[PDB]
Symmetry: C3
Subunit: 558 residues, 3 copies
Amino acid sequence: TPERVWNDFMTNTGNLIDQTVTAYVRTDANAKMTVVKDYLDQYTTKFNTWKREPNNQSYRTAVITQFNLTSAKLRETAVYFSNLVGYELLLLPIYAQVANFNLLLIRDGLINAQEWSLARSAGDQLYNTMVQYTKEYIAHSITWYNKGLDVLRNKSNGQWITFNDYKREMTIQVLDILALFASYDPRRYPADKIDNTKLSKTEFTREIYTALVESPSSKSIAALEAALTRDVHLFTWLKRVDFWTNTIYQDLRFLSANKIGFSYTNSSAMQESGIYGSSGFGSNLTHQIQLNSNVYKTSITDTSSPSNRVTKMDFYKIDGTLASYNSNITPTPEGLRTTFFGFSTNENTPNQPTVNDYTHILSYIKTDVIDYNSNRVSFAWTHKIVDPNNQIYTDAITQVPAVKSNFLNATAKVIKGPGHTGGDLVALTSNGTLSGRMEIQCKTSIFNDPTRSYGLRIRYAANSPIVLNVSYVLQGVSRGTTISTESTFSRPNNIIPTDLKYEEFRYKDPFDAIVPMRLSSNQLITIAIQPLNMTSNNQVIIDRIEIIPITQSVLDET
Amino acid sequence: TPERVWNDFMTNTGNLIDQTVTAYVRTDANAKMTVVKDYLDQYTTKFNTWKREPNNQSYRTAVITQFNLTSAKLRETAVYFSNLVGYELLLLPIYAQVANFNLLLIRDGLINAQEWSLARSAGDQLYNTMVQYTKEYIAHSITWYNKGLDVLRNKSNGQWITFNDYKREMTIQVLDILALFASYDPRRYPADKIDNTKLSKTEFTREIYTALVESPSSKSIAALEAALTRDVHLFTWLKRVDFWTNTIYQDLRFLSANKIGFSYTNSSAMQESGIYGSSGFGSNLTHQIQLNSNVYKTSITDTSSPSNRVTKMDFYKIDGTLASYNSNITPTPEGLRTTFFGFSTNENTPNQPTVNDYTHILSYIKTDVIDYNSNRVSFAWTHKIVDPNNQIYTDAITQVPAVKSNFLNATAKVIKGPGHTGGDLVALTSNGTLSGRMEIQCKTSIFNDPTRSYGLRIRYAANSPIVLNVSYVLQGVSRGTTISTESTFSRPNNIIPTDLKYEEFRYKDPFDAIVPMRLSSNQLITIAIQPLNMTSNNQVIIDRIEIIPITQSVLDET
Amino acid sequence: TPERVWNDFMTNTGNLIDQTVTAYVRTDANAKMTVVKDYLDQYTTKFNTWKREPNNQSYRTAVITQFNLTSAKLRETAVYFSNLVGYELLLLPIYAQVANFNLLLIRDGLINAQEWSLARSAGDQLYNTMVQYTKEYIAHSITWYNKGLDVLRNKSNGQWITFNDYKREMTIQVLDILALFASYDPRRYPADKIDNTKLSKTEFTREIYTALVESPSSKSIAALEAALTRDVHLFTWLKRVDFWTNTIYQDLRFLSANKIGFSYTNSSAMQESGIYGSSGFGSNLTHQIQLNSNVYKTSITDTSSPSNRVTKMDFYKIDGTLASYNSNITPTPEGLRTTFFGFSTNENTPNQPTVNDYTHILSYIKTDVIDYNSNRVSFAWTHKIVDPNNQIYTDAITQVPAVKSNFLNATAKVIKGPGHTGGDLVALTSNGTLSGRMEIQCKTSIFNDPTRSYGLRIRYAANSPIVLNVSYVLQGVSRGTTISTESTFSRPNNIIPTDLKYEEFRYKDPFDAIVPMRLSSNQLITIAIQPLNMTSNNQVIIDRIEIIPITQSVLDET
Ligand SMILES: [Br-]
Ligand SMILES: [Br-]
Ligand SMILES: [Br-]
Ligand SMILES: [Br-]
Ligand SMILES: [Br-]
Ligand SMILES: [Br-]
Ligand SMILES: [Br-]
Ligand SMILES: [Br-]
Ligand SMILES: [Br-]
Ligand SMILES: [Br-]
Ligand SMILES: [Br-]
Ligand SMILES: [Br-]
Ligand SMILES: [Br-]
Ligand SMILES: [Br-]
Ligand SMILES: [Br-]
Ligand SMILES: [Br-]
Ligand SMILES: [Br-]
Ligand SMILES: [Br-]
Ligand SMILES: [Br-]
Ligand SMILES: [Br-]
Ligand SMILES: [Br-]
Ligand SMILES: [Br-]
Ligand SMILES: [Br-]
Ligand SMILES: [Br-]
Ligand SMILES: [Br-]
Ligand SMILES: [Br-]
Ligand SMILES: [Br-]
Ligand SMILES: [Br-]
Ligand SMILES: [Br-]
Ligand SMILES: [Br-]
Ligand SMILES: [Br-]
Ligand SMILES: [Br-]
Ligand SMILES: [Br-]
Ligand SMILES: [Br-]
Ligand SMILES: [Br-]
Ligand SMILES: [Br-]
Ligand SMILES: [Br-]
Ligand SMILES: [Br-]
Ligand SMILES: [Br-]
Ligand SMILES: [Br-]
Ligand SMILES: [Br-]
Ligand SMILES: [Br-]
Ligand SMILES: [Br-]
Ligand SMILES: [Br-]
Ligand SMILES: [Br-]
Ligand SMILES: [Br-]
Ligand SMILES: [Br-]
Ligand SMILES: [Br-]
Ligand SMILES: [Br-]
Ligand SMILES: [Br-]
Ligand SMILES: [Br-]
Ligand SMILES: [Br-]
Ligand SMILES: [Br-]
Ligand SMILES: [Br-]
Ligand SMILES: [Br-]
Ligand SMILES: [Br-]
Ligand SMILES: [Br-]
Ligand SMILES: [Br-]
Ligand SMILES: [Br-]
Ligand SMILES: [Br-]
Ligand SMILES: [Br-]
Ligand SMILES: [Br-]
Ligand SMILES: [Br-]
Ligand SMILES: [Br-]
Ligand SMILES: [Br-]
Ligand SMILES: [Br-]
Ligand SMILES: [Br-]
Ligand SMILES: [Br-]
Ligand SMILES: [Br-]
Ligand SMILES: [Br-]
Ligand SMILES: [Br-]
Ligand SMILES: [Br-]
Ligand SMILES: [Br-]
Ligand SMILES: [Br-]
Ligand SMILES: [Br-]
């Protein structure tokens, strides 16, 4: 009775013999990871010892020696996990973990390169290695994530639920990790002087989905994907959920449709979605629930046969309250079942997190009719790490993904991210006359200084040197500048890239230590980016803007 | 046809597929050990080269580099062997071997820490590592030894013979190794100046058993354990074996009972055991064999159906002679079989060692009646390393386990060892009025000095700071001192601990370089330990006393 | 459906379970090799960096550290691959690759020993390691190559084709690699000053065979080996192929016999072989093909039932032309099939190399009658690396195997090589009166100097200190010298050794920097070796002569 895991479908699972060997591969892999962790423990112990007495030659030699051994072991393990043919997909999650550790360790070596070396500045070679490895690890992960996706997508009578299960697990266990790599570059993101383990916080803006779907389903993966998931969009915050009920027959009252009230980041306007489901004759709006608090867990109750006839949905809010949709069907139907959805750090409570261990909050709901009275209901979730105020930290580089903008003009649109950026991107294009414009509103933190200086950096991709107008508005007053992008990528026929690589993202600093943004305490800042007279084939794709506190160190570095 | 090993019962052995994978795990483990040994060979080669020319910077650098690589490899392998889930028990023996090598190597690094390092005294961190690893390796080994033991103990219709086979093999292949770890501490046991590989000799005082038991047996594991093994006791030396025979019917003369004549270490008194078996009507004492020489091999002859009707037993002595029990049954019964018992270093002659390769000697025999004329017969064995004279070496630290005492008062008793000390312990307690007292007689070696100085150290465990009266008698004259123990452990309700940990054993030196024991050549020394007015809840548990030659080095160190 | 490989016959292949585990072993081995290659990549990258700025202490430290880690990993992997019991033969090819890499890396360390070390001359210990490893790797490879050979040789109803397939694959994948090891010794073959990767070119003179044999065949392995392969001989070059056809019945015209016209290296004489096959009544010589250009691919066409009735053979020459044998049978028989033979670097075109990727050329053909009109036809192949002019390079040590001689007297004979020298050897013995003499003609390259000096070295094995007369003839003038061999080996009854070990081959320099060979440009040089009054039990076995350009470096070194 070999154990089965969600990502073992590319191995031979048709027989007990192969399944047993696969089980061994997993067991050996875990043992190798325990060895990796022991090497890391040895490094940390010697590192801490050295830090307490930096001038001790013996401590210095010991940590350098351990750094070299541990670094070699991490790299070797990543190579092994990505080169055991036939098990690439199976080992992708553990590979991502070791790759993650490998890069974090190298970051440590770069931070202390000067102190450890005698000639100093010997971090150049190690830096090139870090960049090379970052590219390799992301490339391998994206390649295999997509290979597995294609396998499930083209599977005969493929089931969408399995396809989605895969995307969700890969996002949580692999893709989210890849998104952290950019922040590990210590030259791009200097380490906190007091606590080197601190990192510029990376946000994962992508949405993952959970859904109640009939099983088996005869609807295609493509059809269900379009009906149950959202097309690319600016990050939204869930504010209200409307529900319709079929009310013609009281003993057959079930959910019939839903609508969503939502808002963009730091926007005072309420957006309204279209209606999902059936809202015609006999289907009436019966509920309008204001979700004033984040929802960290939901449950849905439906009949078993026929399935998917929904009588209730519960929404658990972080403020401890519960909101619910009830069809008020009477009498109560037979065979009701309740399914929970949510994400927890506790492996023991998979779909039932508590207010203390949830990792995602509800962002959307879509209803898709199967037959009269029966529907598939999907729940979209966003990572709890996303800041609803686009707050600018006083003590670290603040990352604010471009999808958290609250304004896009006609030639600015959200496009699908490549998979390693943590979410989607904003493409600024030109129809020949109008150039794409994005506006993102951020909130400064509370501080005593009359004003503080901050640099403004942009992580982007561009297919040509394009002049950008970048500005920031504070208290009705706008200040701007111009800066040109470099050509970071090229694609045949200049089609919007769906496969941007890590190396195709670069950085530009419209505002810096010389001419920084001068911001006051606890104010709403409007930052805007818009190309200046750009051609119809030129493209500027923004991943995120970054706000950099201008300190003495940043000043000298610049 | 996968190979089966005594300790693979915790793996899935119900099918050929799992058995085949398990066979591979064993094969890969052996290959990893061969790699470990090659790393050790490389270290030794470079070490020897450096030793011949210590000042050669190139040799010094080479051995340090190899030490670091080999040390890393040994640790990594120990971690792997203890973290391959589902194979912990299977790999315990090989894990013990690598753990053993890992600690011996670290000992080497500590011994040469000063010469190899440039700042010197850099052995502190390495020392902490050695202590940490020692605790980890013992903990893992004891945990799994006991898990496997419980599995066999609670097995439906469990067979005692399998249970005992397991304890015996685990003792020889794992537990005995753990007992050596304490002696590897170079701060506690300074390395011999001439030959660093020399170690303070550790004695394994535990008894292992072999037995002729009917198969299958309907008697419980608990019942057979009590009937075939000995309750905790001071170490004894086998001096005489008495045998009874059922003599009513000449054609049915078989072994019916046995008694043992034994002596404590360096005791001139002969102790007599109770009679084991049937000694009533028709059962008569027919043999009294004086075992003047150690027995290294035995054989027992019994009928096959019914089995266990014993007609003969042979005892092979190291002086080349043979002693035998013969029931004198006439005529000779049909279906006689002979079974040999013994322990050899030669894997080819399992139960039949020669006078040149035996590892254990006979210490006891117990008979347990199955039915009239049929008996189970157990043979107890002690390790040949145990010194029958408690001799004090002139050139090394002498270890003398407390169980080798020859006197215990009413409040002093032997208690079961935790499994990593090589045998049992002596607990000195108090009934409120009398405190436990133990006396151990040791023999000094032959030397020319009028008298030599020796320190006296005690490895013990205690649940409170208790004052101890420690003395030594030489030529009728007693000299003593007092020293207090430290609190090394605590247990709920102050119950005698059956699970003392390595860290719960500490050391105290009643006699040292300042005030040592002054002993003359080739004399019997009586050493005694007894708490001074101890409370009824206080406990002092002695593992062993150690005699330390007081040399210039020991003097300066103290 | 586990994959099957030619050298897995020593593993349990009788069932799917074992085959599946074996498949995993292969997959894991490939992953380990990918790790090995990554360690090598890291070394190379750091090496190149250091070379560009040798005085950079940081670069120097980095490459030394990587050298140590990578060297440790290569050795560890070689040990693992040779100590995974039950898989020695299966892993022999990959083991040879890692052993090869291990030695090449150590060579690198020796070359840069002085620059990397601070005390210098620290290469002695590393050199001993290299020699030790070379002996170990060759010993393991030869031992297992022969074990596998014996298994196939003594297989019930053993098939010669399988036996030969094995010898051929082992030669290409293992034996040829072993032959390179001698040249890796940097003390024996100093590295090229400009490009350290350059090596003294080693020639593999052995022949491998391909053949069309009936299947199954009732003829023994020994019988077919004798009938289809050549007895030991001096290296020969294929010049002409003669073919006989059975011509009595026009509708049954098939190949009946063949003869070979060949020449020794740099010999103006044409040698004629005996006739192989049937050449009596009804069998007539119909073809005499002059092979003026090397043949890199052949094909043979025969009927299917009965099989082996040959109607055509095509010979693809490197000059782009095609020569063919045609039986002219009429009408064309039914069931004709065509089989191709050849060796390519392209794994996709196994038996069909192109003029751009072939690795071997045709050296011989033998025909063996099965029944009237049906024959087995074997094709012998020599490695394309063999120089047809025994050219003496101007810029490197030239190796010229003794089998490339073109003259041997009565007491000089070719003997079977041990398997690690790349081919056979020349044994110079004595019948008491005449001592063996070998003559090899080499061509100097084109250069402008009136004359250049070259040392002459001999790689040999000898069972006693024997005086050798060594001479070289240039433009009719002979110059000679005498030098004695050392005793390098001993065998019972002084039987010609069939198992010479690496350590049993040593070197002697008849001509050196002091008294070198003085050769002019583009001339044919005749080099001869012949013992001086040698006893009947003395033996001098020559592997190869080596010509050494006498440069300033060689002069100072000598
Ligand atoms: Br799973
Ligand atoms: Br697949
Ligand atoms: Br160190
Ligand atoms: Br890739
Ligand atoms: Br930078
Ligand atoms: Br930094
Ligand atoms: Br820190
Ligand atoms: Br779901
Ligand atoms: Br779910
Ligand atoms: Br559909
Ligand atoms: Br949508
Ligand atoms: Br949008
Ligand atoms: Br609202
Ligand atoms: Br509500
Ligand atoms: Br749950
Ligand atoms: Br606009
Ligand atoms: Br704040
Ligand atoms: Br304002
Ligand atoms: Br401005
Ligand atoms: Br610019
Ligand atoms: Br600009
Ligand atoms: Br392009
Ligand atoms: Br950049
Ligand atoms: Br300003
Ligand atoms: Br345009
Ligand atoms: Br066994
Ligand atoms: Br179990
Ligand atoms: Br070294
Ligand atoms: Br444990
Ligand atoms: Br100590
Ligand atoms: Br020491
Ligand atoms: Br020593
Ligand atoms: Br037994
Ligand atoms: Br036994
Ligand atoms: Br019982
Ligand atoms: Br007892
Ligand atoms: Br006792
Ligand atoms: Br007696
Ligand atoms: Br006797
Ligand atoms: Br035996
Ligand atoms: Br007393
Ligand atoms: Br003595
Ligand atoms: Br006395
Ligand atoms: Br006293
Ligand atoms: Br004290
Ligand atoms: Br005291
Ligand atoms: Br307690
Ligand atoms: Br202590
Ligand atoms: Br005294
Ligand atoms: Br008391
Ligand atoms: Br194959
Ligand atoms: Br075999
Ligand atoms: Br380095
Ligand atoms: Br060998
Ligand atoms: Br040499
Ligand atoms: Br060289
Ligand atoms: Br080079
Ligand atoms: Br062939
Ligand atoms: Br072939
Ligand atoms: Br035959
Ligand atoms: Br021949
Ligand atoms: Br010949
Ligand atoms: Br010709
Ligand atoms: Br032709
Ligand atoms: Br082909
Ligand atoms: Br001659
Ligand atoms: Br030339
Ligand atoms: Br001439
Ligand atoms: Br001459
Ligand atoms: Br000589
Ligand atoms: Br000579
Ligand atoms: Br010999
Ligand atoms: Br030599
Ligand atoms: Br001359
Ligand atoms: Br002679």
